[PDB]
């Protein structure tokens, strides 16, 4: 995932602001080929991260606040990119019991530029539900737009929480799902 991460990003910035701003964009980094490919590349970490900074000085936007309208593009852009995939899915708490069995096992088949960590799954409930990654680059704010911009297709109402004993450490990130009453708030505490 990085020649189809260009693509919403060199999109939004035309629409979003114009042509004159994605220009100066291109500016900050240098093309020696075309500059704009496939999906089927591998570039590096650091390259996305370049025109994040430019992103985040040129239009005044935060990283945080940015990475997670990002998210709600990107992740619709596969929607209306796998017709059939739609299809497949049933609802978006089946799509959590769905991402790790062929979702994520599909591509890795048919894609071998990618890895991916550890991935479990427990059951609490109904109304909980336990995700545990195991990452070495674990970035919350990525994750919730990501696990948001599907519920925003979906117009749905979930909470993504997190837990304080992980909440500031590495590694090892507890997550909870809770579905709320979806009308309801401060029923309890925290
Ligand atoms: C909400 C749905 C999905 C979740 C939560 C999810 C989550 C993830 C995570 C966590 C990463 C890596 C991010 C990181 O570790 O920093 C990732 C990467 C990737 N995802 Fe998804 N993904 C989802 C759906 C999709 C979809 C729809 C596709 C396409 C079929 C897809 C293709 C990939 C590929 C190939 C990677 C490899 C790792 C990478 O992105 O660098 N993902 N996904
Ligand atoms: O004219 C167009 N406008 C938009 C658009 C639609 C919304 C929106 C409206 C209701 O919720 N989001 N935004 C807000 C926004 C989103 C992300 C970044 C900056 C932003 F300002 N931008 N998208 C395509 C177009 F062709």
Do not use: W
Not at 36 to 55: A, F
Not at 94 to 122: N, W
């Amino acid at each position: 995932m990085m020649g189809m991460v260009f693509t919403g990003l060199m999109e939004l910035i035309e629409d979003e602001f114009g042509y004159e701003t994605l220009d100066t964009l291109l500016e900050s980094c240098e093309l020696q080929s075309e500059g704009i490919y496939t999906s089927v590349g591998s570039y590096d970490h650091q390259e996305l991260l370049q025109l994040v900074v430019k992103l985040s000085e040129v239009s005044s936007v935060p990283v945080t606040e940015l990475v997670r309208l990002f998210g709600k593009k990107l992740f619709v852009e596969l929607i209306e990119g796998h017709p059939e995939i739609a299809n497949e899915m049933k609802d978006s708490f089946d799509l959590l019991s769905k991402i790790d069995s062929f979702i994520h096992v599909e591509v890795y088949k048919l894609y071998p530029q990618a890895e991916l960590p550890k991935f479990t799954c427990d059951r609490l409930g109904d109304n909980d539900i336990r995700l545990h990654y195991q990452s070495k680059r674990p970035f919350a704010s990525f994750a919730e737009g990501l696990l948001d911009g599907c519920a925003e297709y979906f117009k749905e109402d979930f909470t993504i929480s997190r837990t304080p004993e992980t909440q500031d450490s590495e590694t090892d990130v507890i997550f909870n799902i809770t579905r709320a009453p979806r009308g309801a708030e401060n029923l309890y505490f925290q």
